[PDB]
Amino acid sequence: MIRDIIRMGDKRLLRVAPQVTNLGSAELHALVSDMFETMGAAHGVGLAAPQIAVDLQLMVFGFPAVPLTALANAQIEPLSDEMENGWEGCLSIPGLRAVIPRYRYIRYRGFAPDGSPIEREAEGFHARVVQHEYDHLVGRLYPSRIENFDTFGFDDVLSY
Ligand SMILES: O=C(CSC(=O)[C@H](Cc1ccccc1)CC(F)(F)F)c1ccccc1
Ligand code: NI
Ligand code: NI
Ligand code: NI
Secondary structure (H helix, E strand, C coil): CCCCCCCCCCHHHHCCCCCCCCCCCHHHHHHHHHHHHHHHHCCCCEEEHHHHCCCCCEEEECCCCCCCEEEEEEEEEECCCCEEEEEECCCCCCCEEEEEEEECEEEEEEECCCCCEEEEEEEHHHHHHHHHHHHHHCCCCHHHHCCCHHHCEECCCCCC
16 A cells, blocks of 8 residues: 655654664554555655655665665664765655765664564665665655755756
8 A cells, every 4th residue: 555755844854763662563564565566656766654654663664776675773873984975865855865974884774573683783775774764764864964955956957
């Protein structure tokens, strides 16, 4: 079941989400399946539960190949201070994109929907997706991270 994605301006994207506590359950499995379908229909590479107005620490991502992943109760830590600039957009901000700095190298930990633990090092684009989705879980959107406002604009127009 494809879910409506809420758009920037909705207060529900500004919340700090609570932890998932129904790992291995049918209800979580149905939510995650809905999230992959929703992401798929929207042509995304990530989707966070607050974007479909579900207040939980849950994201799905994947597609430089990023493994298809469902991640609950995510924790992230940089593995160096090295930042890298790259293009981001957001399903809740359709048509736009900007250049955003992120950590080039991270580790992320949490749980798969069946309750097994996940722990991975990631770099580049893989790492960026995860940081971007993690931001949704703490009520943060990418415009609050732009440094160079010349890069912010509509996808079909931008020539940076
Ligand atoms: O459609 C997008 C941009 S929209 C998107 O998928 C967001 C994830 C994202 C894309 C690119 C960089 C960082 C995060 C998801 C959000 F909005 F749910 F939180 C795309 C970008 C690069 C390659 C292929 C497709
Ligand atoms: Ni399509
Ligand atoms: Ni987003
Ligand atoms: Ni490497």
